[PDB]
Design an enzyme around this catalytic site. Sequence first.
Site, PDB file in Angstrom:
ATOM      1  CE1 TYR A 509      -3.879   2.145  -0.075  1.00 44.62           C
ATOM      2  CE2 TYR A 509      -2.740   3.286   1.843  1.00 44.62           C
ATOM      3  CZ  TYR A 509      -3.725   3.216   0.805  1.00 44.62           C
ATOM      4  OH  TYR A 509      -4.427   4.329   0.607  1.00 44.62           O
ATOM      5  CB  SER A 592      -5.687   2.588  -3.719  1.00 34.88           C
ATOM      6  OG  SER A 592      -7.119   1.799  -3.518  1.00 34.88           O
ATOM      7  CE1 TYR A 593       1.746   5.751  -2.258  1.00 35.29           C
ATOM      8  CE2 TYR A 593       0.345   7.678  -2.322  1.00 35.29           C
ATOM      9  CZ  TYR A 593       1.486   7.252  -2.303  1.00 35.29           C
ATOM     10  OH  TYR A 593       2.506   7.919  -2.364  1.00 35.29           O
ATOM     11  CG  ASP A 670     -12.289   3.945  -9.346  1.00 32.39           C
ATOM     12  OD1 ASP A 670     -12.290   4.938  -8.627  1.00 32.39           O
ATOM     13  OD2 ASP A 670     -11.483   3.067  -8.988  1.00 32.39           O
ATOM     14  CG  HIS A 702     -10.806   3.171  -5.573  1.00 28.00           C
ATOM     15  ND1 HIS A 702      -9.954   2.946  -6.680  1.00 28.00           N
ATOM     16  CD2 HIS A 702     -10.213   3.035  -4.530  1.00 28.00           C
ATOM     17  CE1 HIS A 702      -8.698   3.127  -6.245  1.00 28.00           C
ATOM     18  NE2 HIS A 702      -8.835   3.194  -5.039  1.00 28.00           N
TER      19      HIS A 702
END
EC number: 3.4.14.5
Lengths: 726, 726
Positions: A509, A592-593, A670, A702
């Site tokens: 992450y 995500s990140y 998203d 997302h």
Amino acid sequence: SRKTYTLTDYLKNTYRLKLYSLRWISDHEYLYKQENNILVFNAEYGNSSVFLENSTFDEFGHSINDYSISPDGQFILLEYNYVKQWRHSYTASYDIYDLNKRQLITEERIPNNTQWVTWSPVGHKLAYVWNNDIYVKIEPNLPSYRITWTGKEDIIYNGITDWVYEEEVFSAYSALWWSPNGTFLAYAQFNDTEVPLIEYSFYSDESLQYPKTVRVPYPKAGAVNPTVKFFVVNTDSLSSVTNATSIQITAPASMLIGDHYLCDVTWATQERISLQWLRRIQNYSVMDICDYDESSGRWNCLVARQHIEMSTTGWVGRFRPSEPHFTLDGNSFYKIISNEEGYRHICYFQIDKKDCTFITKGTWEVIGIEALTSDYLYYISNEYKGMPGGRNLYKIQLSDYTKVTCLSCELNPERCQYYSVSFSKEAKYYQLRCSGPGLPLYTLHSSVNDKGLRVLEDNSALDKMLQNVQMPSKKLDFIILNETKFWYQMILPPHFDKSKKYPLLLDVYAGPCSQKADTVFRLNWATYLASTENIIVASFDGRGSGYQGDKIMHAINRRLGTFEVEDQIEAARQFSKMGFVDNKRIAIWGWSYGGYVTSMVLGSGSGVFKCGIAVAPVSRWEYYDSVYTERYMGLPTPEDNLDHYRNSTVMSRAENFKQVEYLLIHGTADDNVHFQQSAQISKALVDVGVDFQAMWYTDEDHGIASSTAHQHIYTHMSHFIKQCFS
Amino acid sequence: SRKTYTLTDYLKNTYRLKLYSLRWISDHEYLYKQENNILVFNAEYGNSSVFLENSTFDEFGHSINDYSISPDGQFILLEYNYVKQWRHSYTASYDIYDLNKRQLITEERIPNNTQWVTWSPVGHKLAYVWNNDIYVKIEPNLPSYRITWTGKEDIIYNGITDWVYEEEVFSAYSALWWSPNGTFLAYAQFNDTEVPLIEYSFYSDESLQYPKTVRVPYPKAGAVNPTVKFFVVNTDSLSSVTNATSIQITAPASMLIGDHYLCDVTWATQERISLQWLRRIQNYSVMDICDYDESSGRWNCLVARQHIEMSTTGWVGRFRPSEPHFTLDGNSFYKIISNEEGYRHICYFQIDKKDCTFITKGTWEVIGIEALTSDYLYYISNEYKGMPGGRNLYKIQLSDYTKVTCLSCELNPERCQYYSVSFSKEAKYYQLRCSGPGLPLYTLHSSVNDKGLRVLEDNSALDKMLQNVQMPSKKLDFIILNETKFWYQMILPPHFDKSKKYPLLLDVYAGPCSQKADTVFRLNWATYLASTENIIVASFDGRGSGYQGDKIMHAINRRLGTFEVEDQIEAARQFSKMGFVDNKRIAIWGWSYGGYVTSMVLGSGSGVFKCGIAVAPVSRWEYYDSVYTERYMGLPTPEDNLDHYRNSTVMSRAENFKQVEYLLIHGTADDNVHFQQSAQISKALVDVGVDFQAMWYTDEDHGIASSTAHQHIYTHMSHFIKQCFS
Ligand SMILES: CS(=O)(=O)c1cccc(-c2cc(N3C[C@H](c4cc(F)c(F)cc4F)[C@@H](N)C3)ncn2)c1
């Protein structure tokens, strides 16, 4: 020996974790819902009674997905026709049930498509938002009082947050705050008038002949932000013929000079409310404490009573400035702020005194303030055993900061090193929630002596079940990068043999203030990968990680996509040197990140990783929202940080992907990390002649969390990883 | 032996086919452009001269992608700033060069962003479309004459077609037709006012912060169609102060009763024009012949002079009703129509006589009428050797239909069985273009005796090059399905050994009136697959195929997605029984209509195919445009053909995909077959728990033809096929 934890077990949830979700309604009782009916429990003795039978609504004619009992105990708010919007927002229909006359209220009911509803703190008053306007109901069966008239879809929001405020600052849809006794109703108003719109297609059911174009006000980095205003209305001074009067609270002057945000509202007393404002350059925040002027009707925020919170090394707060916790008389408060040493600790303020006094200190951090009595301050921190991935409840004597007592540390140190807590109304009792490293354990305690009253749930059923399966183990430890220690965790296959060489998957992450190395017990994809496929799944918390002080967290300030991805590479490099890792089979994946980091790592040309999966990754910061991006990156202008904005994209590294096997996944709907981000990654890869794998998920956002999409993406990713490793 | 034809050879075009593109400017001369300069050739002797040096425009200051010489020989239209739109449409800037004074005309120049430009048939008049309006220029340097004023982007089109007319009926952007001597300018006007819009995202360059939403008037099956009007203006009766007068030609009454289309306009004489109209139910078409009324100025279309063309077995024409070829006096004409036996042949009409006389007949079809002299009628057909996949030029004596002579059959029967032709102005000379089965051969001939004048291009250079590479061979033959014969072709690997068992790839299109089995020479992906990978690439023309009579072509009438996909399965079934096919490794792939068929086959549950690739496939007919879909499917209403519309979708077969390996590919900017179609396929597969492979191509349209995307998709598909077969 028996079986392993399979993919099907994970996707079909064959091994269910039991919880004990209770809801305190007093300082002595709590409601414990069940599959059928709601019971009321007496915390002291443990005896219970039925609050309302499951059958009660057999013929309601609608599926009820949620209930909400007025603090009165007199009414029950029934929520149905749920329709999710963004991460927190959603619309639904509501019906009120009179628990007194046991009758369903049918007059002057709450409108359908209501955006938000909340009972007052004490009585049974109702405040709801419909069509972007606020409405107050003093009595469930009485007509509503319109509070606002400026409501306008996608333009003006009253009492609810717009897209970016919901996701980035308040983590909620609600933008209204009742005063303690319910007299006042405060709320924020957001104006998205000039905010650019993100537009994307939504295909819907097969029968939709023409796709629909969804458009939502979304400020990308450096774009025009929504503006905000704050108001407070006296819900006791409303007629039924006069349009209510909302008193606006403006400024501070230091904020009005430019773009800013409202980042926190916390009532102090019945007539005092605190507000925290943040400049668009989230370096500087200001807190205003305002009092209701009796014979004037307005609210005044005495300068001198305002407190400045700034940072010279980074942004303010972990994600947003912390919330204050006021003493009974509202004349002083406690709030978590960063040390002079960079560690977050509790500081004690006098509302009209500039300097505060730190009541805690050390090379660890206070995670949060959980309760405040006239006697003690209860908080959760990661001080115990010096492990930042652990959580424990502590209480500190307000009379002598020297007296801090750990209330969870020793309860069961083997099975429990990660706690969360839930106090009764006056903190007379509290429930402890242990979530790892062993099976989750829920218990009840009384604050007077911190006596354990009884075990609420020990997941013994799940325990019996798991002893018939070869479960993986978890290793929590740290390594040392030039002077500093950085933690990591590894999900180890059953019967781990440090002599053997296993393939490794770096689960990543790595976003600012993130933590992927902790003592939490989990049953997820990694469990399957380790248990059934004998893959080691590791996670590392490097530069940028949280809960370890600012020297570490602020390391990536204005520099996203640098040290945090580099340390991830360095970690894998050190793992492949521990002796039980086949350095020919090291993979990396993230969402995500973590998708962004995974992509940056795979495009780093380090050669350490054979393959990798990026799910809904950010590809270039100018594509992500302003509030989040700018907090760590500043503005994308040549005068500020544009150069690094341009240097930290995934596409600029397209060429390096020739050395790896990449799987790019993204939901077409998203609204958070726009499909656009992956569309640009794929395009740069094609333009450079790099082959890779891809998978779009039609109409998924997302979370790609719909039941079918969820099983499908994890199944697709399992095949990819196994192919790369086998 | 040496090397094979590799993927790189195909993608990098290492083996180039030479052509001989000439442009007739008279009945005796033709222009033959070169890389540098344009030459003029004398057809009789072959001597040439330079028409204009390459250097001529060294300092034009713009890259010229195309030239256009006025039939006058006096001027040269220079096209630059080319910006492609749809399949045929595009905009550009134009400059006129005076070949007389060798000067570049700088006054009253054609506007930039011009949509279409065309010289008159004889002089040097110019007609162009800008901002959807028509403009005429009698002299290159003189001011323009505005002809229309209703032009309105995406709403009203004057002189150009809207999206559906460009793609489905005219195969062109141009919607204007000059009369023979240039006196009259006829044109169509399209109204898209109530046509629904298809909207999709366009990401553009990385620097675009917010994606743009493209919207284009596109009528999906059963939706509101654009309306059309026709006008004719006398370009000799225009002042410079008076707004030009366009005379409208309406009806026929049989068309006005409901939705209809303008499907053809062909001038007969200087004062007579023919128009063909088609009802929305493309079962019935009507031709109007209109004459210019001297002392009235209007145009009259005498009923009695109109000819009805209808079909009881299917639609009219192959794709649209055929064009008429008028005799010198415009009193009679020849046009290809369907036989009483269902075969397309040339019928001779008297403009004021209902019944026509067929001048050709037999179980073969006339492909097209190429030239008409007072003496003969030249046409191309597939009569020779009874092979429908062959093409030859024939001439028939108008005085005695008994006298038909084949002009290409015997020229070189081994190397040439597929010809196309290009006649000089008065058909005094003609160029023959042989495109297979051997290397393309271009020759010149004189019509008086059909004497071969000389070889223009024989691709000897390519021939020398190919003898150093192991090239695959092509087999053209047929099989027999209950009484009828259906042709197929197979690209066989070098050194084919009927004793060995090869994996097979069914290359499919199969749309109505399609032909994938012919004698054409090709260097494509299939060449590589066979030459380097030893894969047999077959193609089959089953029910629905064209050029074999209506019993075969109209078989799938109102029944798309049935017999044509079934026969494809049946063909593979018979191929796997010829002895040289490994029935464990049979794949199938297709693009466009072939993507739809590929998907329907893979979802048929036949089990015959192991894997398959669908590129930009249609998934359900209600998603495709009205003109094309309705032609074969009728209307999607319960009163018409809705049930079959609902029974022929790909998603309804999602469950059957569990038995195969599927690769779904689609360009995100596909304005033709909207990404929506694949988005719905993927969604149905996910909802059913079927794993598959996918690949989107950001900003690519139906052709996925940009240089980088092209190489990337074929590279991705090669890996997939090899993995499935190896
Ligand atoms: C000889 S002509 O008379 O000049 C004349 C005139 C006017 C059209 C033609 C024509 C049109 C045609 N197509 C095929 C095409 C298509 C089909 C699909 F199923 C797709 F998924 C995508 C598609 F692009 C559709 N968009 C039109 N194919 C051949 N010929 C030919």
